[PDB]
């Protein structure tokens, strides 16, 4: 299982080894040995979520406060989504930068988003199903959103032929990256790096 | 999340609460609190597998030796499969009995199969995708198969319009339930119950 670190350190694109046969195909989405190899520790799966999205739906950008924050291991099992990770860790060398992975049912990649990072996606097709393993259960009291179209982050979302994204009400009213930063709610690089080190 | 114990004790059918909105739908597939409620302990996810199957493919019947065996939390995210669990635990009150759950992308149910049970499924539609969380990594040296069409177990598979199942080569040559039993490879109820108790 090929794992490539993204331009945001602590986020990875994983490409599975897909076994194809007369019955269809099989692959190992996660393995503890494969995960540990790139992440340096085991993924503690406390929750697994699934969404189905129509074309142009944008969910994000979410993060969870440290600790324990909420690491995400994210894949698309039908359709396709353009998935984004944002370095929101203050003091990080790449603070403010983002990168993307194309998740879909063709190459069946995954994005791993480690703790204190922000994540979201835009569904590129109808009936786009995303599953994601989380290192913590849903905790609306420590989960935050950043406007997915925030001009400081300036993520380049690939609009669908060629229309405005559909967002939830909460995601549509999300505060700006600068609002969140100035609220002292962004994770700190020093502590996220240390928290990941104590797991390793 | 509604959890109903099957006729095989230690296997459960889980029905999620599906949240539907303008974007599509979302649900929590697993939560630690929801899992613990019915299973009495946390699921230790060490591997997650995914298959895509065409109509009439039958995978099974697999089990893993205790300990730690391999508990499975199994769902269908596209298409539909008829999923079977078999009580292969010697000394169990329901030794030899089986039950089924219909997994599909409509009701989005799950089957939880605890340790020392045997599991399999028959895909009822093309492009039937199954994901499953496992409490242990793939260990071909402690994993065994029982003929899915074994006459002692006598599972009633729902053949697809109306043809023989397609099996892997290994599953097509699997030994009989009585071969496995007589090889002392079946799990023991007393130890599986005790192993689950030490986790609880």
PDB file of C-alpha atoms in Angstrom, chain A residues 21-34 42-43 45-54 57-59 75 77-78 108 127 129 131 133 137-138 166-168 171, chain B residues 21-34 42-43 45-54 57-59 75 77-78 108 127 129 131 133 137-138 166-168 171:
ATOM      1  CA  UNK A  21     -10.347 -11.520 -10.076  1.00  0.00           C
ATOM      2  CA  UNK A  22     -13.379 -13.204 -11.612  1.00  0.00           C
ATOM      3  CA  UNK A  23     -15.524 -12.229  -8.597  1.00  0.00           C
ATOM      4  CA  UNK A  24     -14.692  -8.551  -8.722  1.00  0.00           C
ATOM      5  CA  UNK A  25     -12.006  -6.925  -6.632  1.00  0.00           C
ATOM      6  CA  UNK A  26     -10.709  -6.832  -3.004  1.00  0.00           C
ATOM      7  CA  UNK A  27      -8.292  -4.667  -1.184  1.00  0.00           C
ATOM      8  CA  UNK A  28      -7.130  -3.908   2.313  1.00  0.00           C
ATOM      9  CA  UNK A  29      -8.272  -0.363   3.047  1.00  0.00           C
ATOM     10  CA  UNK A  30      -6.421  -0.124   6.300  1.00  0.00           C
ATOM     11  CA  UNK A  31      -3.988  -2.421   7.908  1.00  0.00           C
ATOM     12  CA  UNK A  32      -2.344  -1.756  11.221  1.00  0.00           C
ATOM     13  CA  UNK A  33       1.083  -2.630   9.808  1.00  0.00           C
ATOM     14  CA  UNK A  34       0.600  -0.412   6.742  1.00  0.00           C
ATOM     15  CA  UNK A  42      -1.624   2.607  15.368  1.00  0.00           C
ATOM     16  CA  UNK A  43      -4.845   4.216  14.391  1.00  0.00           C
ATOM     17  CA  UNK A  45     -10.662   3.919  15.514  1.00  0.00           C
ATOM     18  CA  UNK A  46     -13.346   5.291  17.778  1.00  0.00           C
ATOM     19  CA  UNK A  47     -15.906   6.190  15.157  1.00  0.00           C
ATOM     20  CA  UNK A  48     -16.578   5.526  11.503  1.00  0.00           C
ATOM     21  CA  UNK A  49     -18.822   7.765   9.452  1.00  0.00           C
ATOM     22  CA  UNK A  50     -20.339   7.505   6.004  1.00  0.00           C
ATOM     23  CA  UNK A  51     -21.897  10.135   3.773  1.00  0.00           C
ATOM     24  CA  UNK A  52     -23.519  10.044   0.387  1.00  0.00           C
ATOM     25  CA  UNK A  53     -23.323  13.277  -1.534  1.00  0.00           C
ATOM     26  CA  UNK A  54     -24.662  14.618  -4.786  1.00  0.00           C
ATOM     27  CA  UNK A  57     -21.786  19.209  -2.298  1.00  0.00           C
ATOM     28  CA  UNK A  58     -18.939  20.605  -0.214  1.00  0.00           C
ATOM     29  CA  UNK A  59     -18.479  19.441   3.361  1.00  0.00           C
ATOM     30  CA  UNK A  75     -11.953   7.221   1.250  1.00  0.00           C
ATOM     31  CA  UNK A  77     -16.231   4.022  -2.262  1.00  0.00           C
ATOM     32  CA  UNK A  78     -18.619   5.181  -5.026  1.00  0.00           C
ATOM     33  CA  UNK A 108      -9.621   3.880  -4.503  1.00  0.00           C
ATOM     34  CA  UNK A 127     -24.050   9.301  -5.258  1.00  0.00           C
ATOM     35  CA  UNK A 129     -20.047   7.836  -0.853  1.00  0.00           C
ATOM     36  CA  UNK A 131     -16.288   6.649   4.515  1.00  0.00           C
ATOM     37  CA  UNK A 133     -12.364   6.238  10.213  1.00  0.00           C
ATOM     38  CA  UNK A 137     -16.018  10.157  18.490  1.00  0.00           C
ATOM     39  CA  UNK A 138     -18.082  13.143  17.317  1.00  0.00           C
ATOM     40  CA  UNK A 166     -24.102  23.082  -2.029  1.00  0.00           C
ATOM     41  CA  UNK A 167     -23.298  23.375   1.671  1.00  0.00           C
ATOM     42  CA  UNK A 168     -25.027  22.553   4.896  1.00  0.00           C
ATOM     43  CA  UNK A 171     -20.823  25.034   6.792  1.00  0.00           C
TER      44      UNK A 171
ATOM     45  CA  UNK B  21     -30.796  16.349   3.897  1.00  0.00           C
ATOM     46  CA  UNK B  22     -30.416  18.434   0.751  1.00  0.00           C
ATOM     47  CA  UNK B  23     -26.807  17.238   0.320  1.00  0.00           C
ATOM     48  CA  UNK B  24     -27.613  13.556   0.492  1.00  0.00           C
ATOM     49  CA  UNK B  25     -27.336  11.482   3.630  1.00  0.00           C
ATOM     50  CA  UNK B  26     -24.918  10.828   6.560  1.00  0.00           C
ATOM     51  CA  UNK B  27     -24.772   8.275   9.262  1.00  0.00           C
ATOM     52  CA  UNK B  28     -22.445   6.988  11.924  1.00  0.00           C
ATOM     53  CA  UNK B  29     -21.488   3.472  10.863  1.00  0.00           C
ATOM     54  CA  UNK B  30     -19.686   2.680  14.057  1.00  0.00           C
ATOM     55  CA  UNK B  31     -19.404   4.567  17.241  1.00  0.00           C
ATOM     56  CA  UNK B  32     -17.476   3.362  20.233  1.00  0.00           C
ATOM     57  CA  UNK B  33     -20.388   4.158  22.555  1.00  0.00           C
ATOM     58  CA  UNK B  34     -22.916   2.396  20.306  1.00  0.00           C
ATOM     59  CA  UNK B  42     -14.629  -1.540  22.381  1.00  0.00           C
ATOM     60  CA  UNK B  43     -13.916  -2.770  18.932  1.00  0.00           C
ATOM     61  CA  UNK B  45      -9.930  -2.196  14.576  1.00  0.00           C
ATOM     62  CA  UNK B  46      -6.713  -3.649  13.254  1.00  0.00           C
ATOM     63  CA  UNK B  47      -7.692  -4.013   9.630  1.00  0.00           C
ATOM     64  CA  UNK B  48     -10.413  -2.836   7.294  1.00  0.00           C
ATOM     65  CA  UNK B  49     -11.167  -4.621   4.054  1.00  0.00           C
ATOM     66  CA  UNK B  50     -13.305  -3.809   1.050  1.00  0.00           C
ATOM     67  CA  UNK B  51     -14.596  -6.009  -1.746  1.00  0.00           C
ATOM     68  CA  UNK B  52     -16.640  -5.363  -4.831  1.00  0.00           C
ATOM     69  CA  UNK B  53     -18.616  -8.327  -6.051  1.00  0.00           C
ATOM     70  CA  UNK B  54     -20.797  -9.136  -9.011  1.00  0.00           C
ATOM     71  CA  UNK B  57     -20.495 -14.208  -5.891  1.00  0.00           C
ATOM     72  CA  UNK B  58     -20.290 -16.065  -2.589  1.00  0.00           C
ATOM     73  CA  UNK B  59     -17.394 -15.409  -0.239  1.00  0.00           C
ATOM     74  CA  UNK B  75     -21.673  -3.528   5.837  1.00  0.00           C
ATOM     75  CA  UNK B  77     -22.226   0.401   0.824  1.00  0.00           C
ATOM     76  CA  UNK B  78     -23.434  -0.214  -2.760  1.00  0.00           C
ATOM     77  CA  UNK B 108     -27.542   0.347   5.348  1.00  0.00           C
ATOM     78  CA  UNK B 127     -21.127  -3.862  -8.041  1.00  0.00           C
ATOM     79  CA  UNK B 129     -19.331  -3.273  -2.211  1.00  0.00           C
ATOM     80  CA  UNK B 131     -16.607  -3.066   3.863  1.00  0.00           C
ATOM     81  CA  UNK B 133     -13.743  -3.682  10.145  1.00  0.00           C
ATOM     82  CA  UNK B 137      -5.081  -8.358  10.707  1.00  0.00           C
ATOM     83  CA  UNK B 138      -5.233 -11.008   7.968  1.00  0.00           C
ATOM     84  CA  UNK B 166     -19.352 -17.904  -8.230  1.00  0.00           C
ATOM     85  CA  UNK B 167     -16.633 -18.729  -5.712  1.00  0.00           C
ATOM     86  CA  UNK B 168     -12.928 -18.205  -5.450  1.00  0.00           C
ATOM     87  CA  UNK B 171     -13.664 -21.211  -1.225  1.00  0.00           C
TER      88      UNK B 171
END
